[PDB]
Design an enzyme around this catalytic site. Structure first.
Site, mmCIF file in Angstrom:
data_model
loop_
_atom_site.group_PDB
_atom_site.id
_atom_site.type_symbol
_atom_site.label_atom_id
_atom_site.label_comp_id
_atom_site.label_asym_id
_atom_site.label_seq_id
_atom_site.Cartn_x
_atom_site.Cartn_y
_atom_site.Cartn_z
ATOM 1 N N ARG A 208 70.851 12.365 111.974
ATOM 2 C CA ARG A 208 70.498 12.135 113.565
ATOM 3 C C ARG A 208 70.355 13.467 114.214
ATOM 4 N NH1 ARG A 208 72.197 7.300 116.816
ATOM 5 N NH2 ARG A 208 69.938 7.384 117.715
ATOM 6 N N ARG A 209 71.516 14.154 113.942
ATOM 7 C CA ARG A 209 71.393 15.349 115.066
ATOM 8 C C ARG A 209 70.891 16.767 114.512
ATOM 9 N NH1 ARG A 209 77.179 14.793 118.051
ATOM 10 N NH2 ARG A 209 77.033 12.519 118.205
ATOM 11 N N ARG B 299 50.122 0.606 115.183
ATOM 12 C CA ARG B 299 50.830 0.293 116.483
ATOM 13 C C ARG B 299 50.177 1.356 117.411
ATOM 14 N NH1 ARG B 299 54.360 2.373 112.446
ATOM 15 N NH2 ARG B 299 55.822 3.907 113.063
ATOM 16 N N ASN C 33 57.774 10.961 117.593
ATOM 17 C CA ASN C 33 57.869 12.196 116.974
ATOM 18 C C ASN C 33 56.720 13.298 117.004
ATOM 19 O OD1 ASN C 33 60.930 12.452 116.336
ATOM 20 N ND2 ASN C 33 60.405 10.301 115.540
ATOM 21 N N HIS D 62 52.791 8.550 118.685
ATOM 22 C CA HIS D 62 54.281 8.240 118.206
ATOM 23 C C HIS D 62 55.285 9.246 118.838
ATOM 24 C CE1 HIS D 62 52.393 5.389 115.293
ATOM 25 N NE2 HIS D 62 51.286 6.484 115.123
ATOM 26 N N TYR E 178 60.266 8.707 107.315
ATOM 27 C CA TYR E 178 61.531 8.703 107.338
ATOM 28 C C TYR E 178 62.162 8.598 105.853
ATOM 29 C CZ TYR E 178 61.830 8.062 112.172
ATOM 30 O OH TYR E 178 61.991 8.178 113.504
ATOM 31 N N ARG F 73 53.051 6.765 124.168
ATOM 32 C CA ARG F 73 53.678 6.595 123.310
ATOM 33 C C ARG F 73 53.665 4.937 123.005
ATOM 34 N NH1 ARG F 73 60.392 7.298 122.535
ATOM 35 N NH2 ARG F 73 60.481 6.454 120.214
ATOM 36 N N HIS F 74 53.367 4.502 121.989
ATOM 37 C CA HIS F 74 53.270 3.098 121.693
ATOM 38 C C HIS F 74 54.575 2.536 121.993
ATOM 39 C CE1 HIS F 74 55.601 2.753 118.012
ATOM 40 N NE2 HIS F 74 54.949 3.936 117.747
ATOM 41 N N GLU G 105 53.638 8.652 113.025
ATOM 42 C CA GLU G 105 55.344 8.820 113.322
ATOM 43 C C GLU G 105 55.977 9.683 112.040
ATOM 44 O OE1 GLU G 105 57.673 7.145 115.757
ATOM 45 O OE2 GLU G 105 57.843 9.093 115.010
ATOM 46 N N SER H 55 60.561 2.340 110.446
ATOM 47 C CA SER H 55 59.172 2.023 109.936
ATOM 48 C C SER H 55 58.511 3.611 109.350
ATOM 49 C CB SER H 55 58.431 1.821 111.348
ATOM 50 O OG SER H 55 58.739 0.535 111.501
ATOM 51 N N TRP I 99 59.000 -3.958 113.357
ATOM 52 C CA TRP I 99 60.218 -3.483 112.875
ATOM 53 C C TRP I 99 61.419 -3.035 113.691
ATOM 54 C CZ3 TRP I 99 59.652 -0.895 107.647
ATOM 55 C CH2 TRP I 99 59.202 -1.866 106.490
HETATM 56 O O1 LIG Z 1 67.941 6.803 119.125
HETATM 57 C C1 LIG Z 1 68.232 7.636 118.253
HETATM 58 O O2 LIG Z 1 68.173 8.791 118.630
HETATM 59 C C2 LIG Z 1 68.718 7.497 116.630
HETATM 60 C C3 LIG Z 1 68.219 8.140 115.572
HETATM 61 C C4 LIG Z 1 68.731 7.723 114.343
HETATM 62 C C5 LIG Z 1 68.206 8.329 113.191
HETATM 63 C C6 LIG Z 1 67.108 9.353 113.433
HETATM 64 C C7 LIG Z 1 66.608 9.889 112.017
HETATM 65 C C8 LIG Z 1 67.397 9.982 110.971
HETATM 66 CL CL1 LIG Z 1 66.682 10.631 109.666
HETATM 67 C C9 LIG Z 1 68.294 9.057 111.026
HETATM 68 C C10 LIG Z 1 69.100 8.405 111.984
HETATM 69 C C11 LIG Z 1 69.545 6.575 114.271
HETATM 70 C C12 LIG Z 1 70.037 5.876 115.471
HETATM 71 N N1 LIG Z 1 70.946 4.729 115.102
HETATM 72 S S1 LIG Z 1 72.015 4.927 114.261
HETATM 73 O O3 LIG Z 1 71.679 5.209 112.698
HETATM 74 O O4 LIG Z 1 72.964 3.591 113.781
HETATM 75 C C13 LIG Z 1 73.397 6.249 114.804
HETATM 76 C C14 LIG Z 1 74.112 5.943 115.830
HETATM 77 C C15 LIG Z 1 74.924 6.890 116.369
HETATM 78 C C16 LIG Z 1 75.091 8.255 115.816
HETATM 79 C C17 LIG Z 1 75.941 9.314 116.104
HETATM 80 C C18 LIG Z 1 75.697 10.767 115.810
HETATM 81 C C19 LIG Z 1 76.346 11.791 116.242
HETATM 82 C C20 LIG Z 1 77.576 11.707 117.318
HETATM 83 C C21 LIG Z 1 77.845 10.059 117.484
HETATM 84 C C22 LIG Z 1 76.807 9.273 117.055
HETATM 85 C C23 LIG Z 1 74.101 8.567 114.608
HETATM 86 C C24 LIG Z 1 73.519 7.493 114.173
HETATM 87 C C25 LIG Z 1 69.433 6.385 116.603
HETATM 88 C C26 LIG Z 1 69.744 5.419 117.853
HETATM 89 O O5 LIG Z 1 69.193 4.505 118.216
HETATM 90 O O6 LIG Z 1 71.263 5.329 118.345
#
Ligand SMILES: O=C(O)c1cc(-c2ccc(Cl)cc2)cc(NS(=O)(=O)c2ccc(-c3ccccc3)cc2)c1C(=O)O
Ligand SMILES: O=C(O)c1cc(-c2ccc(Cl)cc2)cc(NS(=O)(=O)c2ccc(-c3ccccc3)cc2)c1C(=O)O
Ligand SMILES: [Cl-]
Lengths: 237, 233
Positions: A115-116, A61, A187, A185, A91, A9-10, A88, A22, A15
């Protein structure tokens, strides 16, 4: 085991330093990310690794990570195959936004969902997006069909368009006995690891692959790992 | 009007370009790397775009290509490497400077090798310090016993470059793909000789410059429509 596979992984991009999404934007490595690639190549060199073919994305990258590794191991002559399918995650409309801008525009709840979630994509990158022509009109994607060029991707989408390349282009090389190196990358590599280990959606979403570190798989003739992934590098790293 | 670009790598380490570097896998010197940077420089100023790249399996040509691709922001292009674009194999002379070559073989014989299209230097034998380094190198392990040279006349070099041009490069140009070739003096001579239908004497007098993009404009039969042009100031 019958086969050996190496992933890398790079590291840090320009950015990442701006905490900007990115995705398909073609950010270069930062100086530190380039040094990470050099250390990974040194690790492969120290361990005597030899490859026969290399795969990477069409993003600089990852390509520069591969170049740096090949230079370190004195295998610049190897055949290299580049594919958008190892890019990658795309987004979508988040491309180009930083952490603050994303939270300001979309709210805590929505960003938490993105995120989840395994299969909820971010917003589409629309034609008025600042990076729409930069990415969607780049000639390196000229040969993609309308349905292939994404406007946005969930993790499921990314994995879905990476695994066809694995199955149809990489697996035959492995079963041909070629020693494969994949420089790509987070993902897209997640896609490959999910397939190799038969991981669940929850498990892959919790897997955070280290950057710049050679990831070694020992594979049987059906490409099933015989043991957990191993990391290469001095004892501390 | 098809557009074809060639680039010859610049200076290699330890003065090896003045020491029959040949099939020894010498890297670029810092100065040769700067030369490649200037050439990519010029290609980007001119707005050149490519679709596919061809190079040898020798790192001084590969690194020249890498540097150019980096300068013109086209690191994503497909790259094809082939031993058939390698530098001439200088046999036993590989690694010697001019004085040592004359000392070991005599001025008369060296002048004959210099002038002859079809007389190779002596073969690289096991006592040569590069023998195992080159002849047992993994990258040539798929070559047949006749394909792997111990030495080459210029005739030999051109003869094994042209099959690759005909079978792999020509079809790409004919599909309109914009080709870049980063290779070496004598393998590029092979291409230039076939393009321009040059004589053996003429090709032996042609010294392509290093680090400078060389532009050809070709018609539907791949015949040039004007002389080669250089890119820069
Ligand atoms: O590393 C990661 O896995 C990561 C991923 C993403 C992300 C990925 C894809 C998309 Cl499509 C959108 C966002 C974003 C990030 N930073 S965050 O946006 O500020 C951020 C911080 C906390 C929460 C959260 C959620 C649920 C319970 C408690 C806390 C959610 C978001 C991070 C990260 O580095 O923490
Ligand atoms: O000061 C607090 O009260 C607090 C606040 C927040 C918070 C405030 C406003 C917003 Cl718009 C979003 C989040 C977060 C906190 N920590 S967090 O739950 O782990 C958490 C961290 C990061 C994200 C996230 C979301 C989207 C993009 C990137 C990052 C989400 C959650 C705390 C806390 O308790 O310190
Ligand atoms: Cl390459």
């Amino acid at each position: 085991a019958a086969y050996k596979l190496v992933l890398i992984r790079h590291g840090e991009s320009a950015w990442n330093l701006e905490n900007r999404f990115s995705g398909w934007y073609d950010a270069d490595l930062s100086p530190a990310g380039h040094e990470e690639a050099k250390r990974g190549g040194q690790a492969l060199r120290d361990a005597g690794y030899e490859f026969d073919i290399c795969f990477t994305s069409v993003q600089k990258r990852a390509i520069r990570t591969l170049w740096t590794v090949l230079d370190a191991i004195d295998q610049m002559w190897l055949p290299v195959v580049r594919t958008w399918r190892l890019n990658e995650r795309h987004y979508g409309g988040l491309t180009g936004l930083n952490k603050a801008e994303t939270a300001a525009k979309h709210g805590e709840a929505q960003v938490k969902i993105w995120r989840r979630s395994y299969d909820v994509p971010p917003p589409p990158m629309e034609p008025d997006h600042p990076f729409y022509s930069n990415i969607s009109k780049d000639r390196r994607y000229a040969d993609l069909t309308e349905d292939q060029l994404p406007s946005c991707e969930s993790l499921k989408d990314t994995i879905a368009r990476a695994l066809p390349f694995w199955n149809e282009e990489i697996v035959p090389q492995i079963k041909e006995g070629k020693r494969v190196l994949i420089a790509a990358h987070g993902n897209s590599l997640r896609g490959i690891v999910k397939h190799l280990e038969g991981l669940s959606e929850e498990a892959i979403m919790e897997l955070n692959l280290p950057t710049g570190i050679p990831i070694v798989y020992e594979l049987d003739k059906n490409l099933k790992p015989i043991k957990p992934m191993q990391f290469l590098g001095d004892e501390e790293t």
